[PDB]
Design a protein around this ligand. Sequence first.
Ligand SMILES: [Mg+2]
Ligand SMILES: [Zn+2]
Ligand SMILES: [Zn+2]
Ligand SMILES: [Zn+2]
Ligand SMILES: [Zn+2]
Lengths: 43, 7, 98, 880, 47, 135, 90, 51, 86, 103
Amino acid sequence: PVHGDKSVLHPVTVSYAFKLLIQELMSMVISPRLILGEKVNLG
Amino acid sequence: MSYSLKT
Amino acid sequence: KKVLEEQGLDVDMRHIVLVSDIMTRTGDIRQIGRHGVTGEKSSVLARAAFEVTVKHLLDAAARGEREEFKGVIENIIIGQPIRLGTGIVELTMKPNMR
Amino acid sequence: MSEKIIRGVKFGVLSPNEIRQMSVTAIITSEVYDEDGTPIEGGVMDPKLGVIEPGQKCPVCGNTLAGCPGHFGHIELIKPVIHIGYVKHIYDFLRSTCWRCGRIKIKEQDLERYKRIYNAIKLRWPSAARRLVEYIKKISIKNLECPHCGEKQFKIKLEKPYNFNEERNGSIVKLSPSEIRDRLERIPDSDVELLGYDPKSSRPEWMILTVLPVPPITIRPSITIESGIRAEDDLTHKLVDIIRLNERLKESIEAGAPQLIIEDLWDLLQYHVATYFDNEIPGLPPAKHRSGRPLRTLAQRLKGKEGRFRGNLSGKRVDFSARTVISPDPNLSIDEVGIPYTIARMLTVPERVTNINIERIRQYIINGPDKWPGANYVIKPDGRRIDLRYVKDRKELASSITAGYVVERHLVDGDVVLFNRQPSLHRISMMAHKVRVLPGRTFRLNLLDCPPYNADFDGDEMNLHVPQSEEAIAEARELMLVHKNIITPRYGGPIIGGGQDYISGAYLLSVKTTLLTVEEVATILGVTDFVGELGEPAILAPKPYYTGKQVISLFLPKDFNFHGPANISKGPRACKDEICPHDSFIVIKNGLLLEGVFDKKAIGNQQPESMLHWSIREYGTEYGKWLMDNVFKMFIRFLEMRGFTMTLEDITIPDEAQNEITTKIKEGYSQVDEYIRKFNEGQLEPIPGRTIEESLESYILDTLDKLRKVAGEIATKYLDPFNNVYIMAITGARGSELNITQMTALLGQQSVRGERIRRGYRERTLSLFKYGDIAPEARGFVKNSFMRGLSPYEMFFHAAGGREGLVDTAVKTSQSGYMQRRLINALSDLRIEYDGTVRSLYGDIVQVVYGDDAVHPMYSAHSKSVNVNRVIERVIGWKR
Amino acid sequence: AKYRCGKCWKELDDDQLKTLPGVRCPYCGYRIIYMVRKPTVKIVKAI
Amino acid sequence: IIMNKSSIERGMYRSTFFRLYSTEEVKYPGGQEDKIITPEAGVKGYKGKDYYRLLEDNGVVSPEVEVKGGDVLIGKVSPPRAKRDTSIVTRHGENGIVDLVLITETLEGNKLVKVRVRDLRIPEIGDKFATRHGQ
Amino acid sequence: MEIKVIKEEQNYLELQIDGEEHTIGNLLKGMLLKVPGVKFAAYSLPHPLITSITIKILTDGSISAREALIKAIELAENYANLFIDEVKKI
Amino acid sequence: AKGIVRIPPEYFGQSVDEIAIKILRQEYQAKASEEGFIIFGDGATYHEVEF
Amino acid sequence: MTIDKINEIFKENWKNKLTKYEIARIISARALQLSMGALPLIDTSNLKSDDVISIAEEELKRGVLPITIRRIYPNGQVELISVRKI
Amino acid sequence: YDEILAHRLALVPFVSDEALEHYRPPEECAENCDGCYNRVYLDVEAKDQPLMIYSRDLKSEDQMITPVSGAIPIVLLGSKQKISLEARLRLGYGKEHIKYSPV
Ligand SMILES: [Mg+2]
Ligand SMILES: [Zn+2]
Ligand SMILES: [Zn+2]
Ligand SMILES: [Zn+2]
Ligand SMILES: [Zn+2]
């Protein structure tokens, strides 16, 4: 929504209620940024 | 399925 | 122990010792709820789910706090496996050996 | 690109520029739709924000509801407004900094030292950092001058909810959001982080609203319920009200008007924004749209037990589950559940086709959805589903499947399910059971499975869940099976065990005087799986007779030894050693039951250190389950082979007993009357430490209790020593000595809250008694029995005494639930490491070693690592 | 189909063809009418 | 408790359960459009051809018929607020026999239709019984 | 009415009969207990809701279990015929 | 380069090298470790490869 | 005795044993593997049940699974335990 | 109601003494091939006063199968009420239903 096509996007499986919570938190001025991580644990 | 490839 | 014994109920002493230890961890007696959960919670989602309020979320946003998903409640909330029981076990396999 | 996981969440305050740049459209107009044209441009229902009806493509993204996340809009506010949820924070941002130069009013060098300490201790000791910042804020608020710019600072007082009125040498001035934002914009980053905030993510002037984000339709869908006009939700109404107020204020200020109405309208717009963020603001009128009902807003959207956290995040509704009334079934194993055919054909489990189970799956497919066992759907490897109801010919489809297909077959015998009974107080209130399909309409539970669920067949219902993945099924089977959890974790002792008919049957079969013929033995043993050699009868001549202990001894292991008393060894049967004329001492040697009976103290549930407990502890839950499945049915079979009833003759006492009871009652009444008569004329020496009128009540209560005990003893002595009621009482099946005393002899003294019944008229309870009477009859002493019957006032006193039980239950359960919730949330994240320590998941140590010797309570011999006496018995008890 | 006037229980029978401004029995002027049993053989098991 | 099955088969504790469905033809004075109780050959919110197979020519099911599942009892259409099918259907998971059909007027000329459906309840495993002493 | 064999040896038989209940099971058990050479004989009803019984026979090896069952059936048939012939005379 | 390669359970019972090379060159448009770990929810084995 | 005698006894006891969680995890992983490909390592003809769970349990019992468990102690020490009897 | 009336009719015992030799037993094919079902009729109506219907009002197609007793009350009819039904009889065992028990 902000970077357009200059960023790489990754898919994550998650409860849809959590996505709804994030969306309605952005409805208020709170800005929740999700920090991703590697699925496969190296070592 | 991941790679985590590096050079 | 005296409260439980008077009613005629049997509870092992190890559970009582553990709850007594966790109740007086920080050098003084702390309420096990609002002051014993939120005191050492270190998590925003779990604390905000304990009591249904947005005050904690607003405080975290104002102070710019960060969550690490170390506990079990937040992982269940977002949908990741917990790190207790079968989540503590790491497996390695050799598929070449049949 | 790779598939990832969520590792953390970074919070903050959303920047107005970031709101502007994340938005797709700007909301300019104030009408929601025109001639039912919701796609009207610039409205709240603009299609660019999202799509909710089934058939439509989003203008922003060529996706339907399956893959279209909501898109946000932005509203450009012309007058800055303040966030109601952040006010306290900006309050601390107004009283702790200079208004002119925008700096903390603490001098330079100590402030630098404080910030150095804070940065050096911020992450290691968060509590110490919080204390430091609160101390800095306190010592900065109490300063009235700014050393940096040499200016005198006034003080600001907070007025609820959101208006700050500063004092400026009189004539208190109301503050506007614009000047507040201008003041907060001047605070440097190095000073805003000293106060415990983050400059790069939560900047204080962003805390003052200039641009407002517009949520998408997917968060506020339009409901077309009641088969009429669509009913919009509260968010759309409040948003459009805010918009229309915005254009009204803009046109009013651009047209020219007195500043008084301008600021009043600004306050109104602020009120709309504040009530949009949160409706239930204290001291304010809640917004009501059309029906006079308060609106539900973002704050109310996440609150209560029906919001997001406790309604959709902590708990949620799941599928593949059922709820049904439960009924008894003693013909099932202790880890089986009987389910009706209708549920079995509705709930399905997906089994993937392999080269090992392909014929069975083909047979399942051949039978349709309506035939059991059968299947409902077939999932092709491509991912598409085929419904077997509309299949033209499934006989060829069964042969057409290969490895890799998925079939959703009906529940079959041996399937693992989760069976639960609310409120689910402890962990074994939800256990893994094996499915058995039976005709009927109720869930069937074994009588031995009730204690862990705390269930009785008065009309209770229970829930059933079906795991749908191989890993979940494997974990449920390997960790949650019923027979694996016979011993409770609260203490070392079995939670699954003999009930009430089982104890009576065991006592009647184990008693010394039981002799069985060959046909009777065969009938008794026909219910079990035992087949083989009975051995020679215990008695050979004159007639071949077996015995109950010989039939019981066929199941005990051939190296089991046990010496202990029985539950009937409490009264005059106490012989305290093996030489007992009664069967009041249990002696087992090398698996042979030589003397003693079975009762609550040998097979009863929740009886630690019983012979059943040791048997389980030494031969596994495997032998525990085998024994409970086999030997516990002969008890019922023999009970119904004999007769077990309850006649009214088991409660009546001979008339010679009633005369003695009456004489004792008269003596007690005379003693109480003497006490009262001598009280009225002094003559009483009170108990030391107690006053007059307190010793009299104690004397009366003591003598009444002694009278009750004596009457109970007299009634017990003259009754039949061997009747069904007495058998049930002594063996521990049902009842107690107090119940027998109340049925056969006087009930005793009724009391409310530990004292005699006193509430009523003045100086008397009822109007049937004289004024100022404290005789035993007038305060609630019942001298009759249930068999004999109660007088009217005795009935009234009994009801008054017993009313408290109908009340206390709800309070007890509510308090228990609240306490358990707090305790669970407190102790949730503790774990046992591989070195024996108890540590939280955050790293810190709670115990150096669990308990004191790293012993699980579940694996302990009744809260003990090992019973050395039991080991010595197990080794050399056959020669004691 | 066919109706029956409600006054005095099984009063009399009327059909669709009685077109009136309101639901009313043409004979006794009663405002409540019921429906007939649609004469047709019905099979019930005596279980 | 244990009950005799033979005495149940003789009709000891059998019972009948009656449920009621009702509908009204609102006159809609605000726009002069009116309701009508007719079948739904071609309508927006159609359900299925077989569902409306029990309705008579007047759109009301006749007494002494075996309804099941979600069959339509009273069939009426609603003007748009494009006619939409708003018909009263039997509740899901329960069936019975249509017991009574009543047609009248609600003091304003609006047609009121009531359909009462009965079903038979035979005692079985899971039914609850009590005495006059709390048992 | 269908029979099947769960286990079978020279001196052991376990037979499951579907379509039968106490009426025949009790009669067969009572007759088997009278046949010489039989050491154990029992019948069981696995579940009251299912019309099916299980008969367990264990002999001492002198006579096969199947032969014992056949002899028991013969005894029962003889008793039934005698009962008919005697009731017809009153 | 160093990476992680996923071996499905259907290719079990064979030496890691050729399967690793096959999935490596199959979709891109080497001594792999003989043992690999297993993650939750998937039966395939993840090996470290120097390709 | 590093820190306590009880801790040494605990570690010695668990040095060569499998906790129930490890057994459950191994069985779950093997069952998931057999459900798709992964032909069994035993003779799947005498088995009473042909479902994947029973085959996984039998394979674990006979000790033919080539699976090792890594136990990472709180101080960083790692221990490798193998389930194959060999 | 129809179900209650059918149950009452089913509980009425009939003289099945000569019918054991002319009708097929349930163990045989008995569900089709007419010749194993008897038919009885009941057509009654009340004119002006309540009327009780007894088992003597059941007319049987086959004359050797009649109700055991003719004085069993079946249903009481109010004014202007009528009943018209046909019932089918067949052999059966008491194991299937208790209405077939002869004792
Ligand atoms: Mg109950
Ligand atoms: Zn979109
Ligand atoms: Zn200044
Ligand atoms: Zn004794
Ligand atoms: Zn009329």
